[PDB]
Amino acid sequence: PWRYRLDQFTKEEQTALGALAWAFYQQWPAKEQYLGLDLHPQAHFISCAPQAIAQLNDQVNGRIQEMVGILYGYDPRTEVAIFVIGPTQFKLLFFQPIPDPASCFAALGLTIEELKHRLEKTLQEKLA
Amino acid sequence: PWRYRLDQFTKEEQTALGALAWAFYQQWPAKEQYLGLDLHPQAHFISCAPQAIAQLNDQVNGRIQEMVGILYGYDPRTEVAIFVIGPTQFKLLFFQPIPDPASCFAALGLTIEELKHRLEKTLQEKLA
Amino acid sequence: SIAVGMIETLGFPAVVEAADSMVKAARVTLVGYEKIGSGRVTVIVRGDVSEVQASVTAGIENIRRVNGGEVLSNHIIARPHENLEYVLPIRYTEAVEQFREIVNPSIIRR
Amino acid sequence: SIAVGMIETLGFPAVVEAADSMVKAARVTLVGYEKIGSGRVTVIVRGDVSEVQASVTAGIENIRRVNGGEVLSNHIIARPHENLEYVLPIRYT
Amino acid sequence: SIAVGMIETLGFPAVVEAADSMVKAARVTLVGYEKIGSGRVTVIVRGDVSEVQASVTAGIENIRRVNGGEVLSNHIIARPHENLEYVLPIRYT
Amino acid sequence: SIAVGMIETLGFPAVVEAADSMVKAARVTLVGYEKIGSGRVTVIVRGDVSEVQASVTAGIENIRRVNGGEVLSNHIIARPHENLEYVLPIRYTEAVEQFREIVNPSIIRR
Amino acid sequence: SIAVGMIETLGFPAVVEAADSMVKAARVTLVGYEKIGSGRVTVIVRGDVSEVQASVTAGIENIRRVNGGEVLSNHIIARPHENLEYVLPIRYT
Amino acid sequence: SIAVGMIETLGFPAVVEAADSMVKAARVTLVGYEKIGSGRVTVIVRGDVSEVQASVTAGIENIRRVNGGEVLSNHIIARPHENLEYVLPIRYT
Numbered sequence: 001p002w003r004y005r006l007d008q009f010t011k012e013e014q015t016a017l018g019a020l021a022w023a024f025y026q027q028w029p030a031k032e033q034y035l036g037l038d039l040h041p042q043a044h045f046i047s048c049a050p051q052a053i054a055q056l057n058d059q060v061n062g063r064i065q066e067m068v069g070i071l072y073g074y075d076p077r078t079e080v081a082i083f084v085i086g087p088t089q090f091k092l093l094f095f096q097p098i099p100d101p102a103s104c105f106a107a108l109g110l111t112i113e114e115l116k117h118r119l120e121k122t123l124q125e126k127l128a
Numbered sequence: 129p130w131r132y133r134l135d136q137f138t139k140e141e142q143t144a145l146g147a148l149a150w151a152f153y154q155q156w157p158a159k160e161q162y163l164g165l166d167l168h169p170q171a172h173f174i175s176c177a178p179q180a181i182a183q184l185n186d187q188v189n190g191r192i193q194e195m196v197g198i199l200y201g202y203d204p205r206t207e208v209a210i211f212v213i214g215p216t217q218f219k220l221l222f223f224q225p226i227p228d229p230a231s232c233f234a235a236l237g238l239t240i241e242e243l244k245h246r247l248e249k250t251l252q253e254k255l256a
Numbered sequence: 257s258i259a260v261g262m263i264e265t266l267g268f269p270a271v272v273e274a275a276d277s278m279v280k281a282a283r284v285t286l287v288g289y290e291k292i293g294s295g296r297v298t299v300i301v302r303g304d305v306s307e308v309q310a311s312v313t314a315g316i317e318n319i320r321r322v323n324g325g326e327v328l329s330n331h332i333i334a335r336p337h338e339n340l341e342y343v344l345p346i347r348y349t350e351a352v353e354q355f356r357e358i359v360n361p362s363i364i365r366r
Numbered sequence: 367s368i369a370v371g372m373i374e375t376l377g378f379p380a381v382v383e384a385a386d387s388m389v390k391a392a393r394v395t396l397v398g399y400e401k402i403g404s405g406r407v408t409v410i411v412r413g414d415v416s417e418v419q420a421s422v423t424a425g426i427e428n429i430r431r432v433n434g435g436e437v438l439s440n441h442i443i444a445r446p447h448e449n450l451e452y453v454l455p456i457r458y459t
Numbered sequence: 460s461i462a463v464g465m466i467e468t469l470g471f472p473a474v475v476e477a478a479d480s481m482v483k484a485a486r487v488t489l490v491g492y493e494k495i496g497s498g499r500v501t502v503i504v505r506g507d508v509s510e511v512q513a514s515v516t517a518g519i520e521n522i523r524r525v526n527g528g529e530v531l532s533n534h535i536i537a538r539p540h541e542n543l544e545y546v547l548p549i550r551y552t
Numbered sequence: 553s554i555a556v557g558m559i560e561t562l563g564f565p566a567v568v569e570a571a572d573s574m575v576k577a578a579r580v581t582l583v584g585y586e587k588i589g590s591g592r593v594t595v596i597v598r599g600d601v602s603e604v605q606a607s608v609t610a611g612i613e614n615i616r617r618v619n620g621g622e623v624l625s626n627h628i629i630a631r632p633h634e635n636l637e638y639v640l641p642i643r644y645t646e647a648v649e650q651f652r653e654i655v656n657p658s659i660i661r662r
Numbered sequence: 663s664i665a666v667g668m669i670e671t672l673g674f675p676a677v678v679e680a681a682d683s684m685v686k687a688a689r690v691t692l693v694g695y696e697k698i699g700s701g702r703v704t705v706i707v708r709g710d711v712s713e714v715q716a717s718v719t720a721g722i723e724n725i726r727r728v729n730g731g732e733v734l735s736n737h738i739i740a741r742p743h744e745n746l747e748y749v750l751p752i753r754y755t
Numbered sequence: 756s757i758a759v760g761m762i763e764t765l766g767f768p769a770v771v772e773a774a775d776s777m778v779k780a781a782r783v784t785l786v787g788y789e790k791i792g793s794g795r796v797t798v799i800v801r802g803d804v805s806e807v808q809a810s811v812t813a814g815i816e817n818i819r820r821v822n823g824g825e826v827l828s829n830h831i832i833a834r835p836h837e838n839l840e841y842v843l844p845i846r847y848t
Binding site: 563564565566568569571572575576581582583584585587589590591592593618619620621 | 761
């Protein structure tokens with residue numbers, strides 16, 4: 001049931017995820033890295049270069065080209081985009097939060113180390 | 129079902145029924161009567177005038193409107209038209225025998241009494 | 257011999273007046289109602305050939321009366337002989353027994 | 367039998383206002399909705415001859431207030447034959 | 460019986476814009492779209508009379524911005540008769 | 553950001569060239585096609601609103617090159633956000649596991 | 663090896679007349695009628711190339727007497743490719 | 756390579772002769788038969804880019820010899836995108 005647990009974690013942690021996205025957006029202002037989420041051992045966030053998500057789309061012959069179009073064009077100041085690696089699957093954590101991710105990081109007052117730790121802790125427990 | 133075993137009795141006894149139809153047409157040259165067949169109490173041949181079958185149709189509001197039109201326009205020298213009275217259903221034995229009814233009466237060589245009797249016995253044995 | 261009368265109309269109200277006039281002005285049975293789309297519907301009657309011929313002619317004459325109704329095509333097809341059946345509702349059980357007394361048990365003239 | 371009323375329009379919204387106005391203006395019963403193609407839809411009512419005639423009159427005049435309503439055909443049969451009840455979709459049940 | 464809103468468009472892309480512009484502009488319930496032929500499709504919404512009025516109005520002003528779309532018919536019945544629910548496709552299903 | 557663009561054409565060969573050019577000219581996915589009769593067929597894609605706008609524009613232009621193709625209507629609708637899924641065939645397992653090794657486990661820029 | 667014959671007709675009464683004439687005039691098998699819109703229906707038959715030709719020739723001639731009937735299209739294929747048997751509706755259902 | 760060719764006709768008998776001529780004049784495979792109404796029917800084949808160009812031209816030529824046949828449109832795609840295989844009926848299913 002890993003797919004539905006990611007839908008709950010997205011709408012419940014709407015402010016926290018926007019805070020982590022805005023903190024990751026300041027790490028790479030030119031969007032030269034994409035905030036990911038790997039589930040091979042435990043639920044942990046990752047990052048990849050744009051050429052990584054592009055050569056993967058070429059290797060699958062355009063199977064995931066829509067996801068590439070979302071990661072390449074989403075506005076980091078108003079939208080959150082996190083790709084999830086699944087067993088031959090990919091799921092986008094794509095949502096527009098209220099307030100914007102700039103305000104979520106400010107209204108929450110949590111560093112990027114504690115944002116990534118709590119969110120990984122919240123997702124590891126939600127999967128059960 | 130009497131409806132199905134009447135269809136077999138029609139196609140199996142096609143020559144015997146055609147002979148009785150012509151023998152009936154002889155005693156009624158102007159077609160003042162129509163050869164019938166009442167299944168209650170047991171299967172037996174009857175007859176009625178065109179006024180009786182038409183008056184019945186008026187009482188049933190045209191539910192047998194098609195059957196009173198076939199009896200009015202069928203050629204007694206080529207085709208056989210016998211009406212059957214069942215429980216609450218009416219069946220019209222209607223067929224064109226390969227030898228005309230006049231030929232069937234001469235080929236069998238049976239009187240109208242011998243045709244009416246043996247046909248009633250044959251049908252009742254099929255229904256029993 | 258029996259036949260099948262068919263009238264195809266442009267419009268549903270016209271085909272209803274068609275089916276009504278066909279079974280009233282002749283001794284036929286409304287046996288079918290088929291739709292092929294694009295506003296084309298066909299009513300189908302059955303009965304004695306002469307009855308069907310008068311049935312089809314009467315139907316076309318009434319379609320020209322209705323407003324917005326048009327005749328598209330019409331034809332009569334000969335049908336093989338068949339042991340036709342007529343199921344009567346229970347409300348007519350008295351009429352059948354009244355008819356059962358008028359009949360004569362002897363098919364022989366006296 | 368019981369009289370039948372029909373109003374065939376060109377367009378679905380106009381056939382609903384027609385059907386709504388027929389049952390509200392007389393003692394009739396909307397029994398069927400028939401579509402035959404080319405945008406031709408028909409609503410079918412049953413009832414007394416006067417009630418059915420009042421329905422078709424009210425249904426047609428109410429279509430004038432529909433933005434884009436167009437009547438294609440309308441018809442009434444005071445006493446339809448009993449054969450049509452079991453073949454044409456004008457029956458209650 | 461809540462109000463009913465109907466917009467008949469020409470073509471499928473126009474009827475999706477009508478269905479989208481009507482649900483996000485009011486508290487109306489999308490019932491569905493009805494195909495009647497000749498490329499004529501009608502979206503149906505249900506809800507309060509005030510919501511349906513603003514909902515149907517929003518659908519009309521959005522079809523003008525559809526390259527190739529057109530509003531064929533539109534109508535709003537404040538209180539549809541009870542009998543229409545059992546005949547015409549105006550229920551949730 | 554996410555949207556759906558639609559192109560309705562008169563003719564099926566025209567709607568197949570449209571759907572093919574829409575995915576070749578943008579980063580969208582062909583979500584399906586629908587028929588409403590009368591020769592009207594609509595193809596629908598989905599993706600980034602700027603990708604979709606680039607997808608629909610190439611679709612309209614490519615239909616002009618189709619012998620006998622004609623465009624009827626086209627529109628682009630904005631949709632709310634949702635968590636999209638992409639189930640890949642089992643033949644691309646070598647691509648999913650190779651990409652999962654090249655990614656950086658640390659999101660902090662060193 | 664078995665030929666296929668077909669007559670496309672405008673209207674339904676002239677389609678039943680086609681199917682009735684095509685089977686009674688030759689030793690062929692009727693596999694059904696295919697509708698494609700605008701009232702265009704095609705009656706398809708299978709049989710020997712000589713039995714199919716007489717079957718289609720009889721059908722076209724009978725529709726000439728149909729009031730309002732019209733033969734839009736007609737064609738016979740003596741030996742259809744086997745790949746068509748699984749794609750086009752030409753087999754007996 | 757990986758080509759898709761298709762011919763749309765007005766009428767059913769002409770589209771059958773088209774599909775029979777394409778698969779016979781070249782090494783192509785008839786994969787789909789599509790109906791969209793208004794008498795428009797299309798037969799879709801797959802094969803090499805050079806095989807399809809000959810099969811489609813053979814299809815258009817033979818339709819001219821069909822009594823009443825008419826070609827509405829025809830198109831050939833060199834090699835379509837992979838996502839087109841899982842959506843449009845250009846494959847066996």
